[PDB]
RNA sequence: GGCUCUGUGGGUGCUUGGCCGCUGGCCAGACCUACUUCAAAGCCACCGGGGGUACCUACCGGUUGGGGAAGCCCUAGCGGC
RNA sequence: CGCAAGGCUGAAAAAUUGACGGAAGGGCACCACCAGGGGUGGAGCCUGCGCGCGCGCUACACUGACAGAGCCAGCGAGUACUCCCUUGGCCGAGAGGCCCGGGUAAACUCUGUCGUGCUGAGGAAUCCCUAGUAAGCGCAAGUCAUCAGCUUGCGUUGAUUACGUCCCUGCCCUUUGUACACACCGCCCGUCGCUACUACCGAUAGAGGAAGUAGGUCUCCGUAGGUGAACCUGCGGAG
């Protein structure tokens, strides 16, 4: 299975380099299909390019399709995006405390698909190898600096991306009575998401909102009560946890239930949470002249 | 990787089981086997809404009830469970003053 | 591609004929009927042959090396072994093609490693 | 999958490799799969709690069979041997490597001994009898066995195949038929054919499972199915 | 005395003869070249993909000059349609 | 450059599909029951958060102390790593370097000496936990965010008790759909909205108020007509 593992993920990369060329052809033949259908002229080198003119004939309809948006690009999430229920479970750092047993107990209630695992013993490597082995979409480390949490590791599954972020201003379910607060309600949320417009954001957006279950379609815009919301400024996300029930037609009340984060990315490696040496996408310049005036997400 | 499903639809006639069968020259089927008349009473004939009468209307169980002789509460009680069922899928003067 | 470029069952089966030669590990993309036009190749069916797919996997040195071996019956793939050198291996059969359960190579390969098991 | 409800009830997991055998327990209670990682897993599923014993071995799973009475299951492995475990206590309390006992091969196009040639040693399929006590084992060769389980003696074995114009029917091939130019049963003998349409030879090369062109000559003799 | 190689025979599938112009002959062979009334039914027959077709070829439809089977007719013929 | 870019104005709906429930029946949950375990909360240290609160760390004796003997790990290699600050003295015109003083495991096992001796294991509550899990033990590293009052790795030793149940506490879902055979099941319930129609009430044909319902073939013959020998049609007859 491992060997089925490394080959998809070798497979997976070759690919990426081969859209990579693919598009920078196809960034010119998009000006031959645009000038077809309006008789602008266009540039000479791509009207005398005679094997574009060949691939072109033949490769038509995925640009079409592409632009009606009816095919996917290809990605870690597009072959099951909303098919299966993505499972996930939560784990401690190597020695647990007991408040940040009681954190990843609240989280593991936020993710209505979740399951805790104790750390214990259990070597990094035996984790990844147990949660291919049983088809766990998706894992998250914690890692406490004195009962508070100051960082988690979204990791994907079987070979997709990692994110590393900073916690701060967190603030634990179990820290209120429980005359106040109570069982979190375990339904299938909707998630609202604010300030993402760059490709690193809705990277970073997608391999967010692919760890929750899909929602049914049919009154998904009227059912449901319970919501959770990402927002970013300055790219530190920002996100809560709300439950709410509609008293009208023009107003809602809200009730929050969940623990508050701003975590802020630190990396995002193309590579799952053993492999040190995988090929990092974004992390945190700092340490540079303009790292902090630079805005990503 | 087989192939993606698609609709295909084949009809079964009212014939025998020993007319499904292949050609041999007596049936392994016995005296019981031989009267399967290969489609459901389900099937020849199911009591629907699309199929009842004018003014009765069929329930849910599969009984013509009428609409003269129903009563108002159950008039009243059937049209909360459809109801149900869809939620789950310049003047004058005087006439200013006066 | 002769077909009109808006038509549905030119799409439909456009996604299936790359689908069914990517995971025949003809082509090496699935997105180009380009790829299908001028890179479906004898040459690339016959290096999706057992021998020079076990060449690439390293099972042997050479493809020389690789039909002699098969053909003395060294190598299963799954759990049959294959006397016929011109197996075609998949993309989902390349993870399970091995050496055969008391081989000589595979007593050879544990001999080098120092892990030679004999029970 | 439930036969009531027509949709998918789950996805069960835990399997480092392809499931090649499944088995329902026959009083109704116990799953048990066997698979390419070199495990067998004792599923419960109907209890409240869905969980996985798993059963190391050695090698690759081909078949498991439960015993009538169901408190034993047998399962045989890709060595060739039959390990029985009992259900209750996930513990091995018996085995057979039966290689010697089912080895009869040489197929044409084989450059192996039959003693040596691997691939025709193992079990495909096993079955348990009606009574409980005989195991009936049949794989890959001549050989159908027919164990007891609780002496674990082979009591009978039996051939299926008398017919020399299959394959693999006899452990000993000879220089009679062995030609200069290969075996003799291996020259193309399509083309002194009279009819065109069986002297076209529309096989597809290198298809071990079935092709519609199918040449089939001298096939090969599996007791695949006990 | 041992290793190695090489050759011959038997076996590796259930035992009814060697040959021929075979109901008879021959294993030493023998005879040698005759006999004849009327050519033939048709179909099919696997070359890798896209592409040009000037030439040749295949197929179809024609054109000049001959050619006349067959069919039809009757003034009967070296006939006539 | 032009349009945008002129204030009956002065802060705090849709609905034939809608609103809220109830009863029954399921499923799930160490935020539930059940059996046990372990924290925190007692004393001191301190990061943190808002004097207080937790989180870690240390100490508190039978599980003892002392001395011998034996025997076990894994991750770790950037010409790189050092805990101070000083009394003196050597060689230093001067800046310094020297020399001497002061402030690859824990564990475990076996073998003996001695004997409980300020030399006391944490209330109410509340939280967590079900197999290499709790817990004990040390070693390494310090990886662009966080972390030395610590953080993350890595190995070692490794149990008790459930692994059933929806009874309590909750959460979700059925009562519509989404598939056909056998087989079963059999019209869940309430308060209103909205719509159509019907009539009613009273102020000025009229906007409101209140209410309910939803069966002569074949052959032959005699004919008459047709294109005549014949042949066809129609009719009337016999077989």
């Not at chain 1, 009340?253 to 975590?263: A, N």
């Not at chain 3, 990517?22 to 790829?35: C, E, F, R």
């Not at chain 3, 294959?82 to 055969?100: H, I, K, Q, S």
């Not at chain 4, 009574?131 to 060769?141: E, F, M």
Request: with cysteine; charged share 30%; proline share 5%.
């Amino acid at each position: 299975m491992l060997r089925k593992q490394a080959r998809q993920r070798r497979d997976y990369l070759y690919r990426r380099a081969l859209l990579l060329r693919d598009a920078e052809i196809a960034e010119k033949r998009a000006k031959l299909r645009a000038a077809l259908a309006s008789g602008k002229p266009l540039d000479p080198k791509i009207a005398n390019d005679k094997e574009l003119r060949k691939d072109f004939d033949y490769d038509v309809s995925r640009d079409i399709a592409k632009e009606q948006g009816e095919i996917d690009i290809d990605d870690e999430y597009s072959e099951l995006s909303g098919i299966v229920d993505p499972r996930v479970l939560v784990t401690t750092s190597r020695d647990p405390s007991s408040r940040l047993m009681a954190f990843s107990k609240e989280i593991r209630l936020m993710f209505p698909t979740a399951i805790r695992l104790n750390r214990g013993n259990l070597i990094l490597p035996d984790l990844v190898m147990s949660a291919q082995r049983e088809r766990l979409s998706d894992i998250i480390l914690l890692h406490e600096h004195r009962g508070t949490p100051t960082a988690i590791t979204i990791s994907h599954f079987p070979h997709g991306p990692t994110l590393m972020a900073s916690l701060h201003n967190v603030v634990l379910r179990a820290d209120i009575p429980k005359s106040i607060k109570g069982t979190v309600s375990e339904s299938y949320p909707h998630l609202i998401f604010e300030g993402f417009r760059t490709p690193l954001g809705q990277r970073v957006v997608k391999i967010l909102k692919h760890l929750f279950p899909p929602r049914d379609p049919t009154n998904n815009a009227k059912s449901g009560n319970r919501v959770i919301t990402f927002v970013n400024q300055d790219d530190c996300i920002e996100v809560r946890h709300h439950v709410y029930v509609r008293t009208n037609y023009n107003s809602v009340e809200l009730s929050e239930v969940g623990p508050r984060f701003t975590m802020r990315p630190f990396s995002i490696t193309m590579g799952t949470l053993e492999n040190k040496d995988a090929d990092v996408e974004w992390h945190l310049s700092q340490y540079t002249r303009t790292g902090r005036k630079k805005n990503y997400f | 990787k087989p192939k993606p499903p698609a609709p295909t639809l084949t009809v079964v006639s009212d014939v025998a089981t020993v007319a499904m069968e292949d050609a041999q020259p007596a049936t392994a089927q016995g005296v019981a086997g031989g009267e399967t008349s290969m489609i459901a009473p389900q099937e020849v004939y199911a009591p629907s809404k699309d199929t009842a009468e004018k003014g009765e209307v069929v329930t849910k169980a599969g009984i013509p009830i009428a609409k003269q002789e129903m009563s108002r509460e159950e008039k009243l009680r059937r049209r909360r469970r459809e109801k149900e069922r869809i939620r789950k899928a310049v003047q004058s003067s005087g006439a200013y003053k006066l | 591609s002769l077909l009109p470029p808006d038509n549905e069952v030119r799409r439909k089966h456009e996604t299936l004929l790359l689908d069914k030669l990517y995971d025949m590990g003809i082509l090496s993309t699935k997105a180009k009927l380009s790829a299908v036009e001028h890179n479906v190749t004898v040459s690339a069916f016959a290096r999706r042959r057992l021998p020079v797919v076990m060449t690439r996997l390293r099972m042997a040195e050479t493809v020389q090396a690789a039909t002699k071996l098969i053909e003395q019956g060294h190598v299963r793939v799954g759990v049959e072994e294959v006397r016929d050198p011109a197996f075609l291996v998949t993309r989902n059969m390349e993870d399970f093609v091995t050496w055969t359960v008391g081989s000589k190579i595979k007593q050879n390969i544990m001999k080098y490693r120092d892990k030679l098991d004999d029970f | 999958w439930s036969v009531q409800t027509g949709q998918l009830l789950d996805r069960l997991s835990g399997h480092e490799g392809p499931v090649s055998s499944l088995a329902f327990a026959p009083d109704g209670s116990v799953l048990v799969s066997g698979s390419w990682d070199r495990t067998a897993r004792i599923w419960s599923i109907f209890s409240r709690t869905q969980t996985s014993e798993p059963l190391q071995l050695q090698s690759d799973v081909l078949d498991v069979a439960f015993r009538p009475d169901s408190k034993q299951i047998a399962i045989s492995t890709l060595d060739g041997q039959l390990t029985f475990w009992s259900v209750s206590e996930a513990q091995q309390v018996s085995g057979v490597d039966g290689r010697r006992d089912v080895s009869g091969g040489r197929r044409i196009t084989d450059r192996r001994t039959a003693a040596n040639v691997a691939g025709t040693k193992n079990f495909n399929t096993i079955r348990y009898s009606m009574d409980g006590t005989c195991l009936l084992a049949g794989g890959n060769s001549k050989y159908i066995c027919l164990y007891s389980t609780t002496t674990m003696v082979l009591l009978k074995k039996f051939t299926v195949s008398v017919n020399l114009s299959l394959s693999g029917t006899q452990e000993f091939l000879n220089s009679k038929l062995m030609t200069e130019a290969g075996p003799v049963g291996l020259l193309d003998d399509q083309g002194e054919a009279s009819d065109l349409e069986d002297r076209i030879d529309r096989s597809l090369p290198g298809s071990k499972r079935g092709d519609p062109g199918a040449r089939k000559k001298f096939p090969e003799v599996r007791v695949s199915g006990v």
